[PDB]
Amino acid sequence: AILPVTEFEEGVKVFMATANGTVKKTVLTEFNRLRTAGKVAIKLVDGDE
DNA sequence: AAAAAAAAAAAAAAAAAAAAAAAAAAAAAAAAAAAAAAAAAAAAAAAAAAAAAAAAAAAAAAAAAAAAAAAAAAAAAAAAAAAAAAAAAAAAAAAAAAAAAAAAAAAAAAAAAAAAAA
């Protein structure tokens, strides 16, 4: 659905996500440092959003 | 009894394979850190709810950037020819369960033999 771009991850950079159903959440980028094809979830998107 | 094929003699042509010994790399299979994910507790920011409020869409109307018309000119994209990449359709296959034929153990009983008694 959405692919943002990141130059290099940093210390206190806070990641901001926002769904089509008018619901938003803010997450810390340090929990996305090295996934390795890892299907880590971010939100419990309710319904079709 | 006729036909056909194997095998063996001896000088010629031409091939193939198993291990030892050390040191390095490359596959390939395991424990074991390490982090997602999930179940089950308490816990706490958000919607609700209500009263109270004032900031931006309406409305008048000028005017100033505009989208259609006209013209000239540049040349992107579309369809027709060929030439490569990459994936389903269909057919084939090597182990693999099923069946059938030959080797080893079995005793019942007797022929021939060896041995000895009176």
Side-chain angles (χ1 to χ4, degrees):
Chain A
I2 281 293
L3 49 122
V5 308
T6 64
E7 295 153 29
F8 287 112
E9 290 81 344
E10 306 184 4
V12 77
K13 270 184 166 173
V14 170
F15 202 87
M16 164 82 61
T18 124
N20 290 343
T22 78
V23 294
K24 192 177 193 135
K25 180 168 77 189
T26 179
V27 193
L28 314 184
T29 43
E30 287 189 345
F31 291 85
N32 299 319
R33 61 183 165 278
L34 288 174
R35 318 312 317 164
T36 74
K39 193 184 80 66
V40 60
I42 311 91
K43 318 176 166 168
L44 303 173
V45 298
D46 61 329
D48 307 333
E49 294 185 356

